Design a protein around this ligand. Sequence first.
Ligand SMILES: OC[C@H]1O[C@H](O[C@H]2O[C@H](CO)[C@@H](O)[C@H](O)[C@H]2O)[C@H](O)[C@@H](O)[C@@H]1O
Length: 560
Amino acid sequence: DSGPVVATTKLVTFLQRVQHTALRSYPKKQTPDPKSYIDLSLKRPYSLSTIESAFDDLTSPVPVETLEKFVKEYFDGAGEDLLHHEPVDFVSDPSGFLSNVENEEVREWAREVHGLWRNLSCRVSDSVRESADRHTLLPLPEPVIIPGSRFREVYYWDSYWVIKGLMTSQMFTTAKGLVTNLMSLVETYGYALNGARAYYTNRSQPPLLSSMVYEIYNVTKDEELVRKAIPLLLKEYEFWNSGKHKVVIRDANGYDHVLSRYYAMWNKPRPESSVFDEESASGFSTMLEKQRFHRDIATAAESGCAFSTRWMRDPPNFTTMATTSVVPVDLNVFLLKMELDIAFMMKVSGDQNGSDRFVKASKAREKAFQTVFWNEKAGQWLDYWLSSSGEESETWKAENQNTNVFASNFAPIWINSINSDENLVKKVVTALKNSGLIAPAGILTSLTNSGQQWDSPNGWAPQQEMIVTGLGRSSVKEAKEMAEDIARRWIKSNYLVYKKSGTIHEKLKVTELGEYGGGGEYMPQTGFGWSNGVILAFLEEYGWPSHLSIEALEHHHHHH
Ligand SMILES: OC[C@H]1O[C@H](O[C@H]2O[C@H](CO)[C@@H](O)[C@H](O)[C@H]2O)[C@H](O)[C@@H](O)[C@@H]1O
């Protein structure tokens, strides 16, 4: 690759060696999660040089008993450097919490979901700050909310929907803390990392930071937060609008549309999945093909949706991942959101000429959505696949739109200039109604059952929320009806799942009421940050009447 690469740490490189040994030692019916080995930290007082030398003696297939003894002796385990934290603003039953939820069974369930913020609340241990080089966990200034289970660290875009839920939970200090943490990542690296781990320094994630700041500010009117956030949001904005992230698509009327793609600064196996990734690339002839494929994999991770037919050139063929060729609808929704957020914030802070720069920017991206992304026949917005490398501008071609149907195709409904357009909303409602994405438990993320997790039969919390929120803001009766119907489907199914398992799941199998989803490279995970956040946010928006059942026995097609 001629393209840019952010180096990793010697620790991460070493821990991949441990990972490879482990995935070879265990029987195929007991293979562990590879991520757990890159989350280890070095047990004092031994240096990395000492532990690597001892690992070399050990490996010079290691039996499972010998390997576990080695790992127990030289490492503190995964997550041991991430400490439980009692959130200062947590209250077991906040006054006025979900007062519009009059179904007492539902409100008590939501209180239990609210209670899970304590489980997800952590603080990076002091050991990390005093000797950061011994941990892959990154130091952070404030306590975090994590997604849960194997996601032993704060993630970027999950934090938005977590924050939406924290605001229902009346936890505005914890919410600001998340923003403070991500702001410190932008300060250090120039972008917000995929997550607060050493092996994520090479990529970002969908740019939700401005939206987090906006949603908090809209409640607390925290002017200091906005003032602190503006220069960091400007850094983030230039990051997405320069270098390999920026592409130019020229339309038939002569307008150059400046848009973004994902682009991880990495061209190797992801350390956290190093064994899986080396295997999946084993079939490529040249090193250059492998490096291109690895960049496309790590870019699909940067998309927040690893993995999906959405990023494959010949779906469902995983080896055809091609994420750096995709100008994605949802990424550019978030960048439109950033331009609107930053214009609002500079108006608030009293920078009128700055606010005009981003009004001009948002109108220009609004033009790009009408020309580059919209597809009138489909009634939705389509990812745009590049013909070339993205170095130089290219001319828009209708055949380069991905006509496959995804929940992300409806992401622009989240933007107020779109959901304010009655005629457009009507077309989108019809397209969503007729797409096949609306399933018993919510909105399918795609229509292809690939075995990947960001595909049918799964639906995902962030994707439900953006469509429900956007549709619910239009003045169109059919849209507000559709949003509430989807929100109650999603709530109900998550409750039915919880009634069985006592846990909230990462993703739902939305083709069936009350089933969680799976697929992909790791087992279904529970917690779960954005899933808790959307459950609570939907309940605050819609409530739940006392006489409306949440149980599976009743299946009304009429609402109350
Ligand atoms: O398996 C390694 C990958 O894990 C992550 O993908 C997850 O991270 C999400 C969103 O930010 C989770 O909350 C979500 O449910 C997963 O899809 C990570 O983001 C990737 O970088 C890792 O390669």
